[PDB]
Amino acid sequence: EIKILSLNGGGVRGLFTITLLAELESIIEKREKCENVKIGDYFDLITGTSIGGILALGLASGKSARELKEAFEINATKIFPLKRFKNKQWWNLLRRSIYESEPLYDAVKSMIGETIKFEDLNRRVMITSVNLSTGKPKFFKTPHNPMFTMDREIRLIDAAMATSAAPTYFKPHYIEKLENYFADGGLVANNPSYIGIREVLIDMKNDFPDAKPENIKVLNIGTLSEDYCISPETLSKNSGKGYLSLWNMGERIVLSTMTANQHLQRFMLLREFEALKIEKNYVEIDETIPNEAAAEITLDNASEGCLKALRGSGKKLAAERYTKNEELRNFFLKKAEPFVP
Amino acid sequence: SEIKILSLNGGGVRGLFTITLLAELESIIEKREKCENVKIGDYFDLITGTSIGGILALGLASGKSARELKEAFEINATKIFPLKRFKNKQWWNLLRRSIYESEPLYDAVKSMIGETIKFEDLNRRVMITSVNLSTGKPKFFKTPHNPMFTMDREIRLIDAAMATSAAPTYFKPHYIEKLENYFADGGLVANNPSYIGIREVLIDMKNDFPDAKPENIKVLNIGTLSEDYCISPETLSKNSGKGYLSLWNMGERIVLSTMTANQHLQRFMLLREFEALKIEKNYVEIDETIPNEAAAEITLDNASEGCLKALRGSGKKLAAERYTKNEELRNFFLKKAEPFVP
Amino acid sequence: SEIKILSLNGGGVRGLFTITLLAELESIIEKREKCENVKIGDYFDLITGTSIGGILALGLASGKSARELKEAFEINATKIFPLKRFKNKQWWNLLRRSIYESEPLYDAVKSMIGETIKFEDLNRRVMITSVNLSTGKPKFFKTPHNPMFTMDREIRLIDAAMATSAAPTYFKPHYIEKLENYFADGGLVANNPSYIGIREVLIDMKNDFPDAKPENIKVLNIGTLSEDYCISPETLSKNSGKGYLSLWNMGERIVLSTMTANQHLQRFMLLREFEALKIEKNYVEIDETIPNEAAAEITLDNASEGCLKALRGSGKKLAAERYTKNEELRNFFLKKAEPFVP
Amino acid sequence: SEIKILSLNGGGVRGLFTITLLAELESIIEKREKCENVKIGDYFDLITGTSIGGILALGLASGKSARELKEAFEINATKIFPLKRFKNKQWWNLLRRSIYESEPLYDAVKSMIGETIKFEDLNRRVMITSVNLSTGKPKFFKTPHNPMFTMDREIRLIDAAMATSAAPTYFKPHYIEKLENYFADGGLVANNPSYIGIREVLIDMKNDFPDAKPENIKVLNIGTLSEDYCISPETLSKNSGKGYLSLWNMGERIVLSTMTANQHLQRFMLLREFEALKIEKNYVEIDETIPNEAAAEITLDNASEGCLKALRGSGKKLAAERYTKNEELRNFFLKKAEPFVP
């Protein structure tokens, strides 16, 4: 059996992902009576996208979900300042990109470091990004495929910065080693679960020479951005200032895209699993916050109320799902094996 | 048996290359096989498509010939993308409206296909790739060839064609009155519908092919001369601090980058799966990389006579060369396909 | 036995792409194969080139390393093609002058190879293509390596490098004082000197390699991202009846189309010959086409920071994948090449 | 196996020498072998050509005798290159427009062969060389003598003749409606089609010649007395100020140098191959430069009476002398080559 952990991209909503992971760590430590546990040791491949990809890199580097959550908590208000979330306007966003790359760069530096590279990792990890300099999607992965060993000298922080560089919400990330600019991985796969299974079946065939979909279990942790849509009130204007709010300043296009690719990847994965008559393998933990609408889902809302709501949702979902669900426990039954390049 | 799929990528004007290649294939089929009144859409069980590729797929499924579609699309592509609106892009106008309007495209679809023909009237299976901006999910307009999914029966073909051809920035989101929803371009999720077409054949068309396998599936992916796209390196070097205006060009670069990246991803997965199955000969794709001075010219915006001439010449040359060389292209049309019964 | 030929095309800063690819190859051998002080030019019995490719060929044959040439060429190419001379091209400036002065290229070549080195002191065979304007016949600069033809024995390497890179309009014709003859770019006759390299090995190498046959010959044609080049469709459609200004946009368009034609023709003959001899694996070409954008900017003489960055990245990526997946590339560097005795 | 090829090398107005020589050879055949209604086309299995050489090759492949072509040449040569346009090359006119209109040359070709005969109607194999400006690749019009390449069946001979003789700076590019592409002179990529003709016979014309080797192939490459073109040294020296306009005379010198160097390279490679195979007697290049013309004054569009009479006299004298002494022409002109079937 092969366990895959895939994290979607949600921006501030990645607080839900990290809180769920930390609460699962705590629940395992108490109920199973373990000592000094790490939640990244229960997955054979930890994919991710955007801040989900950042968390995946953090888990692969050996950092536990609790210190990761603490770093997220301290850096959440600095990555996504209130002064930037408010006062967007068309004129400001037509001349620059909202939010700066320095704050989340410092956050990632405190998260994983600055000199760590893909070669030193002991866990398999596959991030997703769009290479703006060529147009082909770029998948930063550890040298688990002997043919795919062109990222050993690339630092983890560079990949994390590249995959989290949303088209409008940030700026494209320049990688010095490759001399190429990269964009957010949500433009190709906001749900890296399906491409994760594809990579497991086709790429890491040396480690597992008889890997089949029946032996692949995926724990996809979302950011509650699945049920995103453009609100009908702003959709049915298409006139003057109404059109300016239709596509906003790029954010509407990017968010609608990322939601659409997430939906398509999850949907085709579900159809494939049903065709294989194996639906227990795909385990997903998602919900919808009350009092928030489909279009109220914002990728950069760092208000205290939203942070508290994400914290509570993560805690309650982790507790309830571990209490009632059996597949999550079977996920967190046996620790995985080191990649050992 | 042998299940054949027609994949038509989305390229707006660049679908002229695909339609010209299909018309030329029909003509050489008639010339060499000594047939008559041939239709390129009668040899395909499923006809996938996206954007202008989706419109062409709907036209072929509706029984129209490739040559009539080619002529109508020539006139309508001249009409849809005016030079007045193409040259007058700027940014003040683009902040208050889309670059083009849907009315010329609606007239184009009506002339090429019709207005009253619905998915139930079709005798050929056809896909339409689109994104629903009201529910946030991708909607795949299909013929009622699966009893479980039949919601498209009371939807006109023109509605689906306008839904799939409504690019985010180029066109306004098309409104469907029956579903009370707004739809956007299908290239946002799948600009190369070959992979989703294969998946649909495997899972959603087992009623007519109970023992359908990926091994005996034939895919003909007619590209739109847009296999590779990139962002200008000088723009990335100098303006990678300025959003929208510069580094995105009113979101045109956003849309194009998303389309190119997801098409590349889907093509890569399709190729890897076929190679793993050792059936790489089952996939036939026609596409060329446009050279230096013409690549920066032929885009999804221009109806200039030069671009149309280049697209038509490339289509004719590619059709002739591939028909003469590739045997698989011959076996694609060696036999017809039985129309599906709802 | 086995004979290896290195052939480089000419594209300007695409020469920087080529030298980046060669330097990354050298680094890959240094790391994976565990070799110290490795020069990429030690594994070829003949190293041909044209224009900037010819300059790199002469540098490698003189005994320099690929990394040294890359480090020199980055700064010297930022110097060779100033943004100033690029910006004001107009039509009167090009009617009274060439685009660039040859002095920056002169100092560049002096930095790479030198000024006192001659063809007689070389240890590895090198072939350089050029056109003799004074006599009309093409001139093929080469270290003798043949008792019957040692004309270029007393000719400096730097003079040949300046002559082969002297584009008809981008530069002025180089004047060799020793021969009292002017010379032009070798790309007018051979942008891709692979077929000519085959002929030279099969003819000139009859003493060093008596049993010379095409089946025991391997070619590594490192392209310079200039495989395809076609004139813009708008100019052909509209101003096909106009003069030098619009159509045939000076030596730029004329020479670019000419070099593209010869490159395609020579590669066509080489591929057809290798198919006839069923040794198609003996030709290894490392090249790729540029997408819609990065096409109007990655040009013959565009030494901008973004363009250089893109070329460097493309070279690194192509080097990595082509060394990883191609067995022929690794087989090229398994054994060194014996230096030739004059 | 005595395969014979008739290759003609460009020349523009200077094709009068080649046509006069061929007509005189016909006359001497009739006057010496006592034969009647002798055509020179059927003594050659393949008739290659380029520019006006390609026009004459198409005329001979159509079945016309060399005398009718010679008379049509004597009229249409002075009808094609007006003295008004020749004396008015100038510089602003050539910057705005081209030197010569294509209507006189179109009328010349129509009066020579016609306007409706296509490549399929021919009974003799023929290769016509041109460069495709729309795709930047060399296009080789040929009769359907190879089943693999048969895309030229529905192409009129007049269109191919116009395309192959469309010099870059002299005539406007020819736009063929059937292929929807613009074409340029074939002399840019191959001004001496002897080598490509031998390659075609070796590896393309194999359906009717399964047992073919270079030792049993004979080529009669009739030049056009322009093999010694060179740039005048004073123009090379004056390339700084107002004299730099003379160098690269609005691209005319560029194209002339490219054609001269290309023909020299092709002849040089063919001679190398034949001497390596010791079959140099199979190559009969029938040309000899006039002794009343500077090597640097070898133009391409001199329609004056003196040049025409010099070409006529040179052709007659060369034909007479070479049939008197050279036994290779006599061995060439013994039997009629069997016509081929499509």
mmCIF file of N, CA and C in Angstrom, chain B residues 228-234 237 253 289-299 304-307 309-310, chain C residues 228-234 237 253 289-298 302 304-307 309-310:
data_model
loop_
_atom_site.group_PDB
_atom_site.id
_atom_site.type_symbol
_atom_site.label_atom_id
_atom_site.label_comp_id
_atom_site.label_asym_id
_atom_site.label_seq_id
_atom_site.Cartn_x
_atom_site.Cartn_y
_atom_site.Cartn_z
ATOM 1 N N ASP B 228 2.937 25.165 -28.347
ATOM 2 C CA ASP B 228 3.829 25.807 -27.393
ATOM 3 C C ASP B 228 3.550 27.302 -27.336
ATOM 4 N N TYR B 229 3.483 27.834 -26.118
ATOM 5 C CA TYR B 229 3.360 29.266 -25.892
ATOM 6 C C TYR B 229 4.239 29.649 -24.712
ATOM 7 N N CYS B 230 4.707 30.894 -24.721
ATOM 8 C CA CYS B 230 5.643 31.374 -23.718
ATOM 9 C C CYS B 230 5.350 32.835 -23.412
ATOM 10 N N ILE B 231 5.901 33.306 -22.299
ATOM 11 C CA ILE B 231 5.816 34.707 -21.902
ATOM 12 C C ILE B 231 7.134 35.383 -22.251
ATOM 13 N N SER B 232 7.049 36.598 -22.785
ATOM 14 C CA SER B 232 8.222 37.270 -23.329
ATOM 15 C C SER B 232 9.315 37.388 -22.271
ATOM 16 N N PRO B 233 10.537 36.926 -22.555
ATOM 17 C CA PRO B 233 11.594 36.967 -21.532
ATOM 18 C C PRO B 233 11.965 38.370 -21.098
ATOM 19 N N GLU B 234 11.923 39.349 -22.003
ATOM 20 C CA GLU B 234 12.213 40.720 -21.599
ATOM 21 C C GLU B 234 11.119 41.268 -20.694
ATOM 22 N N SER B 237 11.780 39.849 -17.395
ATOM 23 C CA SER B 237 12.963 40.435 -16.776
ATOM 24 C C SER B 237 12.682 41.828 -16.227
ATOM 25 N N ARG B 253 -2.235 37.388 -21.061
ATOM 26 C CA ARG B 253 -1.157 36.473 -20.721
ATOM 27 C C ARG B 253 -1.575 35.464 -19.662
ATOM 28 N N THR B 289 5.079 23.899 -34.927
ATOM 29 C CA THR B 289 5.491 25.101 -34.215
ATOM 30 C C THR B 289 5.684 26.227 -35.222
ATOM 31 N N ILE B 290 4.967 27.324 -35.028
ATOM 32 C CA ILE B 290 5.011 28.427 -35.995
ATOM 33 C C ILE B 290 6.370 29.115 -35.910
ATOM 34 N N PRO B 291 7.041 29.376 -37.040
ATOM 35 C CA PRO B 291 8.388 29.964 -36.992
ATOM 36 C C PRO B 291 8.428 31.372 -36.417
ATOM 37 N N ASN B 292 9.636 31.931 -36.319
ATOM 38 C CA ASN B 292 9.913 33.149 -35.564
ATOM 39 C C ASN B 292 9.000 34.319 -35.912
ATOM 40 N N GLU B 293 9.042 34.784 -37.161
ATOM 41 C CA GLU B 293 8.313 35.999 -37.511
ATOM 42 C C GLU B 293 6.809 35.783 -37.581
ATOM 43 N N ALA B 294 6.359 34.548 -37.784
ATOM 44 C CA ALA B 294 4.931 34.277 -37.864
ATOM 45 C C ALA B 294 4.328 33.884 -36.524
ATOM 46 N N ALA B 295 5.136 33.351 -35.603
ATOM 47 C CA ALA B 295 4.615 32.985 -34.289
ATOM 48 C C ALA B 295 4.113 34.208 -33.536
ATOM 49 N N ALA B 296 4.868 35.305 -33.579
ATOM 50 C CA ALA B 296 4.452 36.543 -32.928
ATOM 51 C C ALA B 296 3.302 37.230 -33.648
ATOM 52 N N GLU B 297 2.789 36.639 -34.719
ATOM 53 C CA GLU B 297 1.699 37.195 -35.509
ATOM 54 C C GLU B 297 0.406 36.410 -35.394
ATOM 55 N N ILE B 298 0.453 35.094 -35.581
ATOM 56 C CA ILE B 298 -0.753 34.275 -35.579
ATOM 57 C C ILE B 298 -1.140 34.015 -34.125
ATOM 58 N N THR B 299 -2.180 34.704 -33.660
ATOM 59 C CA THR B 299 -2.700 34.537 -32.312
ATOM 60 C C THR B 299 -4.206 34.348 -32.399
ATOM 61 N N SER B 304 -6.551 38.885 -40.075
ATOM 62 C CA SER B 304 -5.849 39.461 -41.211
ATOM 63 C C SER B 304 -5.662 38.417 -42.302
ATOM 64 N N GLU B 305 -5.668 38.886 -43.553
ATOM 65 C CA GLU B 305 -5.594 37.974 -44.690
ATOM 66 C C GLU B 305 -4.319 37.142 -44.660
ATOM 67 N N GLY B 306 -3.211 37.730 -44.203
ATOM 68 C CA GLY B 306 -1.965 36.983 -44.140
ATOM 69 C C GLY B 306 -2.031 35.802 -43.190
ATOM 70 N N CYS B 307 -2.591 36.016 -41.998
ATOM 71 C CA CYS B 307 -2.708 34.930 -41.030
ATOM 72 C C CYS B 307 -3.623 33.827 -41.545
ATOM 73 N N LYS B 309 -4.234 33.097 -44.715
ATOM 74 C CA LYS B 309 -3.517 32.412 -45.785
ATOM 75 C C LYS B 309 -2.491 31.440 -45.220
ATOM 76 N N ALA B 310 -1.737 31.876 -44.208
ATOM 77 C CA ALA B 310 -0.736 31.004 -43.605
ATOM 78 C C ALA B 310 -1.386 29.785 -42.965
ATOM 79 N N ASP C 228 13.907 26.863 -37.598
ATOM 80 C CA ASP C 228 12.906 27.399 -38.508
ATOM 81 C C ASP C 228 12.964 28.919 -38.505
ATOM 82 N N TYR C 229 12.706 29.511 -39.670
ATOM 83 C CA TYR C 229 12.550 30.958 -39.786
ATOM 84 C C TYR C 229 11.774 31.233 -41.065
ATOM 85 N N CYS C 230 10.601 31.841 -40.933
ATOM 86 C CA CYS C 230 9.784 32.212 -42.076
ATOM 87 C C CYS C 230 9.428 33.688 -41.992
ATOM 88 N N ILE C 231 9.266 34.312 -43.159
ATOM 89 C CA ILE C 231 8.936 35.730 -43.211
ATOM 90 C C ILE C 231 7.527 35.948 -42.662
ATOM 91 N N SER C 232 7.321 37.100 -42.029
ATOM 92 C CA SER C 232 6.042 37.405 -41.402
ATOM 93 C C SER C 232 4.915 37.356 -42.431
ATOM 94 N N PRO C 233 3.803 36.678 -42.134
ATOM 95 C CA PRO C 233 2.723 36.561 -43.127
ATOM 96 C C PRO C 233 2.115 37.889 -43.541
ATOM 97 N N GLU C 234 2.049 38.873 -42.640
ATOM 98 C CA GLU C 234 1.449 40.155 -43.003
ATOM 99 C C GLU C 234 2.253 40.855 -44.090
ATOM 100 N N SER C 237 1.684 39.092 -47.382
ATOM 101 C CA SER C 237 0.344 39.286 -47.923
ATOM 102 C C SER C 237 0.147 40.703 -48.443
ATOM 103 N N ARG C 253 16.340 40.384 -43.206
ATOM 104 C CA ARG C 253 15.412 39.419 -43.782
ATOM 105 C C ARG C 253 16.079 38.579 -44.862
ATOM 106 N N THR C 289 12.398 24.679 -30.934
ATOM 107 C CA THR C 289 11.763 25.858 -31.496
ATOM 108 C C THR C 289 11.230 26.743 -30.378
ATOM 109 N N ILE C 290 11.253 28.049 -30.618
ATOM 110 C CA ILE C 290 10.823 29.025 -29.622
ATOM 111 C C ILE C 290 9.328 29.282 -29.807
ATOM 112 N N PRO C 291 8.569 29.483 -28.724
ATOM 113 C CA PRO C 291 7.114 29.657 -28.854
ATOM 114 C C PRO C 291 6.695 31.011 -29.405
ATOM 115 N N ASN C 292 5.385 31.275 -29.388
ATOM 116 C CA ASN C 292 4.800 32.499 -29.932
ATOM 117 C C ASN C 292 5.503 33.743 -29.409
ATOM 118 N N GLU C 293 5.464 33.961 -28.100
ATOM 119 C CA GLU C 293 6.330 34.971 -27.520
ATOM 120 C C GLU C 293 7.718 34.378 -27.304
ATOM 121 N N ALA C 294 8.681 35.256 -27.020
ATOM 122 C CA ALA C 294 10.110 34.957 -27.034
ATOM 123 C C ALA C 294 10.613 34.644 -28.435
ATOM 124 N N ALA C 295 9.806 34.900 -29.462
ATOM 125 C CA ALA C 295 10.213 34.743 -30.851
ATOM 126 C C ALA C 295 10.631 36.058 -31.488
ATOM 127 N N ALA C 296 9.827 37.107 -31.321
ATOM 128 C CA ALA C 296 10.197 38.426 -31.813
ATOM 129 C C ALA C 296 11.354 39.035 -31.036
ATOM 130 N N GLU C 297 11.739 38.438 -29.909
ATOM 131 C CA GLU C 297 12.812 38.962 -29.077
ATOM 132 C C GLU C 297 14.073 38.115 -29.090
ATOM 133 N N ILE C 298 13.959 36.794 -29.203
ATOM 134 C CA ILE C 298 15.140 35.956 -29.369
ATOM 135 C C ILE C 298 15.490 35.966 -30.851
ATOM 136 N N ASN C 302 20.035 40.130 -30.550
ATOM 137 C CA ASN C 302 19.323 40.710 -29.411
ATOM 138 C C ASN C 302 20.037 40.305 -28.124
ATOM 139 N N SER C 304 19.968 41.446 -25.004
ATOM 140 C CA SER C 304 19.331 42.059 -23.849
ATOM 141 C C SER C 304 19.388 41.102 -22.666
ATOM 142 N N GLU C 305 19.263 41.667 -21.463
ATOM 143 C CA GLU C 305 19.428 40.865 -20.254
ATOM 144 C C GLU C 305 18.392 39.750 -20.179
ATOM 145 N N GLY C 306 17.135 40.057 -20.504
ATOM 146 C CA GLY C 306 16.117 39.019 -20.521
ATOM 147 C C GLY C 306 16.376 37.966 -21.581
ATOM 148 N N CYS C 307 16.801 38.396 -22.772
ATOM 149 C CA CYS C 307 17.113 37.447 -23.836
ATOM 150 C C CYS C 307 18.277 36.544 -23.451
ATOM 151 N N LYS C 309 19.209 35.792 -20.398
ATOM 152 C CA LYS C 309 18.718 34.911 -19.343
ATOM 153 C C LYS C 309 17.936 33.743 -19.931
ATOM 154 N N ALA C 310 17.042 34.032 -20.879
ATOM 155 C CA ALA C 310 16.240 32.980 -21.493
ATOM 156 C C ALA C 310 17.113 31.996 -22.259
#
